[PDB]
Design a binder for this molecule. Structure first.
Ligand SMILES: *[C@@H]1O[C@H](CO)[C@@H](O)[C@H](O)[C@H]1NC(C)=O
Lengths: 49, 39
């Protein structure tokens, strides 16, 4: 109760494993990413799939 | 960011001395002298 103001859409929630808010999740899902080599990838690139 | 050979992983958290990769840092401390790796 912050004086009647609703901050529930920008505050984090404990249900998600990553403590990101609703608008943060919308921003992260909206920007598509290339899924580059920052993830470990040589095991995926070795197996021809 | 790969794997680290020659540094023990500790379950503590300090300031980042030597930045390694995604959330992993390494430092030189007394706990004899040794190189550790932490978050
Ligand atoms: C704040 O908004 C959410 C939906 O955006 C709503 O579920 C919640 O009840 C609101 N908070 C209050 C105190 O009404």
């Amino acid at each position: 109760y912050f004086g009647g103001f609703n901050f529930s859409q920008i505050l984090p929630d404990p249900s998600k494993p990553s403590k990101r808010s609703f608008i943060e999740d919308l921003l992260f899902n909206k920007v598509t990413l290339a899924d580059a080599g920052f993830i470990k990838q040589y095991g995926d690139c070795l197996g021809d799939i | 960011a790969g794997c680290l050979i020659g540094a023990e992983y500790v379950n503590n958290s300090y300031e980042c001395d030597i930045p390694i990769g995604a959330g992993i840092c390494a430092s030189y401390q007394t706990q004899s002298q040794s190189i550790i790796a932490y978050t």
